[PDB]
Amino acid sequence: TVIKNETGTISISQLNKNVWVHTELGVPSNGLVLNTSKGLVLVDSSWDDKLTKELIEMVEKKFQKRVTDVIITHAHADHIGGIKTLKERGIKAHSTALTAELAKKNGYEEPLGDLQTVTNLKFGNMKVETFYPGKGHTEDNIVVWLPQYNILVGGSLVKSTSAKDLGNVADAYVNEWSTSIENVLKRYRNINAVVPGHGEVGDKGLLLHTLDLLK
C-alpha cells in the first residue's frame, strides 16, 4: 500500500494497520509514521524544512490527525534539517541530549534532548522505545523499537541490502559500529521488520549485512 504525493517526492507504505514508512527523495531516506489514537508520531522527519512541511501535510491530511511528535535519530543535516518546521508548528522533537548538542553546535534549533540510553514513550496506544546502542554511523545515532510490532527503525546505523558500502563515514566510528550493531541484535532478539535509513525494509538480516559491510 504505497501512497505517493503530488510529485512522488514523498511516498508512504503501510507496514501494518498503524505504522507506515515514509520515504522522501533528497538518495531516498526513510522514517516511520505512527498512527496513534493521540496523533501522528514521526520517527524522523525529512532532509529539510520544505519536505518536512510536505510530509507533515501529507500525513495530517491522510490520517486526519496532527503530527504531535517526531523522534530524531541523529543530528546530521538530513535528520535535523526540518527542525525549524517542527518547532514552529509545536511539534515535539525528541532526541538524545547528544543529538541536540550536536544540532546546536551545527547551528540548528535544538530538539528536546529528552531521550536517554533507553527511553520508553507511549503515544495513545503506541509504545515506542528509543535505544542508544553506541556509535556507528554517527556518534549519536539511535534506533527506535516498536515493541507491539517488533519493528526496528535502524536509521542510518542500518544499511539496506542494496547498500554495498557504508555511505558517508566522515562522522562514523567504524570500529564501534559493529559493537553497536551487536548491541541492537542483543536487545532485540526477535525482529519482525527493520527499516534501514535508506532502502528497503528488511529483517535482522540488514544488521548482519551492515556488520559485513564493516569488515
The residue annotated as part of the active site, out of 44, 48, 69, 78, is: 78
**Quick one: which of 39, 26, 49, 34 has its CA closest to 153?**
34
The residue annotated as part of the active site, out of 16, 106, 125, 168, is: 168
175 in active site: no
Degrees, nearest 5: CA angle 53-79-152: 105
Give the residue with the Cβ less far from Zn ion, 76 or 198: 76
**Least CB distance to Zn ion at residue 155 (A):** 8
- Region of 60-68, 118-126, 151-159, 176-184 interacting with Zn ion (CB under 5 A): 151-159
User: Beta strands 39-43 and 28-36: pairing type?
Assistant: antiparallel
69 in active site: no
The residue annotated as part of the active site, out of 18, 22, 74, 141, is: 74
198 binds Zn ion (CB under 5 A): no
Site map (CB under 5 A) of Zn ion, residues 68-97, x = contact: --------x---------------------
Give the residue with the Cβ less far from Zn ion, 169 or 208: 169
**Least CB distance to Zn ion at residue 106 (A):** 12
The residue annotated as part of the active site, out of 76, 79, 198, 209, is: 76
Q: What is the 3-state secondary structure (H, E, C) of the chain?
A: CEEECCCCCEEEEEEECCEEEEEEECCEEEEEEEEECCEEEEECCCCCHHHHHHHHHHHHHHHCCCEEEEECCCCCHHHHCCHHHHHHHCCEEECEHHHHHHHHHCCCCCCCCCECCEEEEEECCEEEEEECCCCCCCCCCCEEEECCCCEEEEECCCCCCCCCCCCCCCCCCCCHHHHHHHHHHHHCCCCCEEEECCCCCECCHHHHHHHHHCC
Query: Which residue's beta carbon is nearest to the bound Zn ion?
Result: 76
Give the sheet arrangement for strand 143-146, strand by strand.
118-123, 126-131, 143-146, 151-155, 193-196
Q: Total binding residues for Zn ion by CB under 5 A?
A: 2
**Binder among 35, 36, 52, 156 for Zn ion (CB under 5 A):** 156
**Least CB distance to Zn ion at residue 28 (A):** 14
**Least CB distance to Zn ion at residue 39 (A):** 26
168 in active site: yes
22 in active site: no
- Region of 26-34, 95-103, 156-164, 180-188 interacting with Zn ion (CB under 5 A): 156-164
Give me the residues that bind Zn ion (CB under 5 A), please. Answer: 76, 156
Active site residues: 74, 76, 78, 137, 168
